[PDB]
């Protein structure tokens, strides 16, 4: 699938403004602004890193420089709940203490029922058996970019638009594939790629925007069939035998 809108771009802008080469200093300025003059560099700002590690209680003093140099989604995906030492300025809130207890608490508990009113509202009003009402009219992919004669453009566009870490984050590995990687290749569970971060939809109806022809809309639009289905329920409940004659 490709978007019909084509945003053409000259090659010269891409070679002389984005890609580093001998006649520009994109890479040198990137190193100067991200590495040498970074205020989280422990080689030049060890005091600030020690101050921040005393504050947050992080075990690694290189973590702030790692955080400030990586994008947001990559920070979200491999966020690991490492242990923090108790001799630190980081605290526990009242709300975090309510939230941490009620992770695996069952029903008929005070904290669990007081902390799960939205799921009680979900199962009270029968939200897993409601049909989808609205679907969008037009659906489109993002705008394609063509550069006439540059495979690096196509490689970068294919890398961004189809990022394997992001795509593996947004879905699951098949179970037989997980079995083949785990015990037939020796890869442990901790070094598996992160998977299943896509949110669950509300229903099975809300999982996609393609709506099948409704059988209920098929039967209810003809009133003769509506009366036939009205009488056929009590005819079947009577334990009967029925013949129907047609012409067409």
């Amino acid at each position: 699938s490709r978007n019909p809108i084509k945003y053409s771009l000259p090659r010269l802008i891409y070679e002389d403004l984005i890609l580093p080469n001998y006649n520009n200093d994109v890479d040198i300025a990137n190193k100067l602004k991200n590495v040498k003059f970074n205020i989280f560099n422990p080689s030049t700002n060890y005091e600030l890193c020690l101050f921040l590690s005393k504050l947050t209680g992080e075990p690694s003093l290189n973590e702030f420089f790692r955080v400030s140099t990586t994008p947001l989604l990559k920070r979200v995906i491999e966020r690991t709940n490492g242990p923090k030492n108790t001799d630190s300025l980081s605290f526990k809130t009242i709300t975090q203490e309510l939230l941490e207890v009620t992770r695996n608490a069952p029903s008929e508990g005070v904290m669990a029922s007081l902390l799960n009113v939205e799921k009680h509202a979900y199962e009270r009003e029968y939200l897993n058996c409601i049909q989808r009402g609205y679907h969008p009219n037009v659906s489109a992919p993002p705008v394609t970019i063509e550069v006439l004669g540059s495979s690096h453009v196509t490689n970068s566009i294919n890398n961004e638009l189809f990022d394997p870490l992001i795509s593996q984050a947004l879905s699951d590995i098949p179970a037989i594939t997980q079995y083949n990687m785990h015990v037939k290749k020796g890869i442990p569970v901790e070094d598996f790629p992160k998977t299943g971060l896509f949110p669950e939809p509300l229903n099975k109806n809300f999982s996609s925007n393609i709506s099948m022809p409704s059988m209920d809309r098929f039967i209810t639009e003809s009133a003769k069939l509506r009366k036939l289905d009205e009488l056929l329920v009590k005819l079947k409940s009577e334990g009967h035998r029925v013949l129907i004659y047609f012409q067409m």
Binding site: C129, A140, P141, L170, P174, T177, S207
Partner: protein
């Protein structure tokens, strides 16, 4: 039986074949010149040749300005798009009022498209993914391909996929024995349901069971779609439905209107023109009705002066009930109808006269016979006196308390004593103002 709310006794303009307005037709009483002008612009819109043509409905309150807009909306039918609007709609807290006006301008230009679709559907028989050589190599995918065996009526196909379509396929949580629907246009798939070739009564997942799809697995079907240009602009501004990173990520951000650029509108217009020139698409211009146009300030009028000169402009209908009122956003500019003269020069003002007592009485008759109420002739004359004495809308909204006070006395007809009791219970604007003047502590 039904529900009525100040309308739905109007079905159309009620004109003849030559455009002359009948006196009592389509639920209308009087307004012969206004209905003839509305018929003239009905033929102008149905000509589908003009852009940036605007009328202005001028008159007092309760004269039939909005009723004429619902009449032209019903006369054009549901095929031609009709966008009702109010002057307070354009003030958005997420985008400027110029962009809201342009979006409502583009939301009144419909489009009929005969679109072909490539469809792979059938019951899933096998599901075997082949793994990669180095799944932890950083780059690349976990799997190489996925073999899907699809079987429909009189056909059976074996499908070898990429990882990318399989991500959307396993996003729907399909399994063995479930019939799917692979739309090959966008890569989106739909879990149709379980098949009834296997068992039915052993499920807890409130499932639905559909038989095998008729025809072969690979299909090319024609679907007639009716979209607007604003939907195309929205779908290209916030892209969803592809099988890429941004197409996933766009469905989970919070929706928010953005200032759509003019370059995107040019590209959308270019691909729409190349759709029409291929014989595929058809352009259906419509009506943008803006009730209470005097609520707009001067900047929206200033942008309207340009937007009525654009080449894909719809037919705009404005309604106002001001005589000589200063335009909002200004202090000294005194203009008719609250509409500044630089746009009034571009308009075509249609005057709407008030009503007489007999017109009031037969309007009460039509609203009584629509609301399923039977009234006496003496109460009918009394309500005509109400309409000619206080207000037409006060006589319109006093039919239902009269009917309820008749029903609470075990009766179907409405008598003059019922109207007197409804006088004693409910007040009007004049009597409330009169009791407001001679008041102790700001009644």
């Amino acid at each position: 039986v039904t529900r009525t709310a100040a309308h739905t006794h109007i079905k159309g303009l009620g004109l003849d074949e030559s455009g002359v307005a009948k006196r009592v037709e389509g639920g209308f009483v009087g307004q012969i010149e206004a209905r003839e002008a509305c018929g003239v612009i009905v033929d102008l819109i149905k000509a589908k040749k003009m852009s940036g043509r605007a009328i202005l409905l001028a008159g007092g309150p309760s004269t039939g300005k909005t009723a004429l807009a619902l009449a032209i909306s019903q006369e054009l039918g549901p095929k031609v798009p009709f966008c009702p609007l109010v002057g307070s709609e354009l003030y958005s807290v997420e985008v400027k009022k110029t962009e809201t006006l342009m979006e409502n301008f583009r939301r009144a230009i419909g489009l009929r498209i005969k679109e072909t679709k490539e469809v792979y559907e059938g019951e899933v028989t096998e599901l075997t993914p082949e793994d990669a050589e180095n799944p932890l190599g950083g780059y690349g995918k976990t799997i190489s391909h996925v073999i899907v065996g699809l079987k429909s009526a009189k056909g059976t196909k074996t499908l070898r996929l990429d990882p990318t379509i399989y991500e959307s396929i396993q996003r729907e949580k399909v399994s063995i024995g479930d019939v799917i629907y692979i739309e090959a246009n966008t890569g989106a798939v739909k879990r149709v349901g379980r098949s009834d070739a296997y068992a039915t009564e052993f499920d807890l997942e409130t499932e639905e069971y559909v038989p095998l799809p008729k025809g072969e697995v690979h299909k090319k079907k024609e679907i007639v779609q009716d979209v607007t240009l604003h939907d195309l602009d929205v779908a290209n501004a916030r892209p969803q439905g592809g099988q890429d990173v941004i197409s996933m990520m766009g469905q989970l951000l919070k929706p928010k209107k953005t200032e759509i650029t003019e370059k995107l509108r040019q590209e959308v217009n270019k691909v729409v023109a190349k759709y029409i020139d291929q014989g595929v698409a058809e352009l259906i211009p419509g009506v943008l009705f803006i009730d209470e146009v005097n609520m707009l300030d001067i900047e929206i009028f200033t942008y309207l002066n340009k937007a009525l000169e654009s080449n894909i402009a719809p037919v705009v209908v404005l309604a106002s009930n001001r005589g000589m009122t200063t335009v909002r956003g200004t202090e000294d500019v005194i203009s008719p109808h609250g509409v500044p003269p630089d746009l009034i020069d571009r308009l075509l003002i249609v005057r709407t006269l008030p009503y007489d007592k007999d017109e009031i009485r037969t309007i009460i008759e039509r609203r009584a016979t629509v609301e399923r109420l039977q009234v006496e002739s003496s109460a009918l004359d009394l309500l005509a006196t109400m309409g000619t004495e206080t207000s037409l809308r006060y006589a319109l909204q006093l039919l239902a308390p009269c009917g309820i006070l008749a029903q609470t006395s075990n009766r179907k007809e409405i008598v003059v004593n019922d109207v007197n009791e409804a006088k004693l219970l409910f007040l009007d604007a004049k009597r409330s103002t009169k009791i407001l003047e001679t008041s102790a502590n700001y009644l």
